Amino acid sequence: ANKGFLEEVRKGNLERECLEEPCSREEAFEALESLSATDAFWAKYTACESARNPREKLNECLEGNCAEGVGMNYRGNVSVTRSGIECQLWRSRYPHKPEINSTTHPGADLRENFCRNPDGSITGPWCYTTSPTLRREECSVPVCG
Ligand SMILES: *[C@@H]1O[C@H](CO)[C@@H](O)[C@H](O)[C@H]1NC(C)=O
Ligand SMILES: [Sr+2]
Ligand SMILES: [Sr+2]
Numbered sequence: 001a002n003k004g005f006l007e008e009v010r011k012g013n014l015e016r017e018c019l020e021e022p023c024s025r026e027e028a029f030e031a032l033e034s035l036s037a038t039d040a041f042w043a044k045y046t047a048c049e050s051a052r053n054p055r056e057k058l059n060e061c062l063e064g065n066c067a068e069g070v071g072m073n074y075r076g077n078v079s080v081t082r083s084g085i086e087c088q089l090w091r092s093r094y095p096h097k098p099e100i101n102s103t104t105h106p107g108a109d110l111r112e113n114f115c116r117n118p119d120g121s122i123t124g125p126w127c128y129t130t131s132p133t134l135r136r137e138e139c140s141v142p143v144c145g
């Protein structure tokens with residue numbers, strides 16, 4: 001957190017610098033090493049600033065199974081929509097070409113055909129659908145607590 005005074009002369013540490021204190025991306029970055037690791041992190045972090053306290057609710061929100069807020073932190077496995085349709089490969093370009101991928105929103109675990117919300121859309125974690133008919137649509141992901 002930089003509570004000043006030769007604290008930056010010591011090894012980076014995630015518990016202590018970011019889980020235990022609020023942190024700058026540069027603090028994570030120093031504590032995490034790899035940057036791909038720092039993109040994923042930040043993304044989870046930044047979607048969990050609304051649930052930083054208790055520090056038990058933060059562990060729930062970073063875990064990724066439940067959705068908090070509009071669930072930009074959802075990192076779970078639900079893959080079929082609200083209508084029941086099944087999601088498209090974010091990787092895939094058919095039947096609809098995604099405009100958000102990995103290149104665009106990389107903190108965001110766009111793995112498989114999983115529900116995600118790179119975008120923080122108001123109606124929650126969603127995905128691209130199979131139906132040539134319907135492009136994208138909300139998913140029914142569990143809510144945190
Ligand atoms: C979206 O990501 C794919 C990789 O799967 C890439 O080939 C495509 O060019 C990207 N589209 C945009 C963001 O340019
Ligand atoms: Sr620090
Ligand atoms: Sr500190």
Ligand SMILES: [Sr+2]
Nearest residue numbers: 008012027030
């Ligand atoms: Sr540091």
Ligand SMILES: [Sr+2]
Nearest residue numbers: 015016019020
């Ligand atoms: Sr601790």
Ligand SMILES: [Sr+2]
Nearest residue numbers: 001016020021
């Ligand atoms: Sr401290």
Ligand SMILES: [Sr+2]
Nearest residue numbers: 026027029030
């Ligand atoms: Sr630095």
Ligand SMILES: [Sr+2]
Nearest residue numbers: 008026027030
């Ligand atoms: Sr520093």
Ligand SMILES: [Sr+2]
Nearest residue numbers: 012029030031
């Ligand atoms: Sr370092």
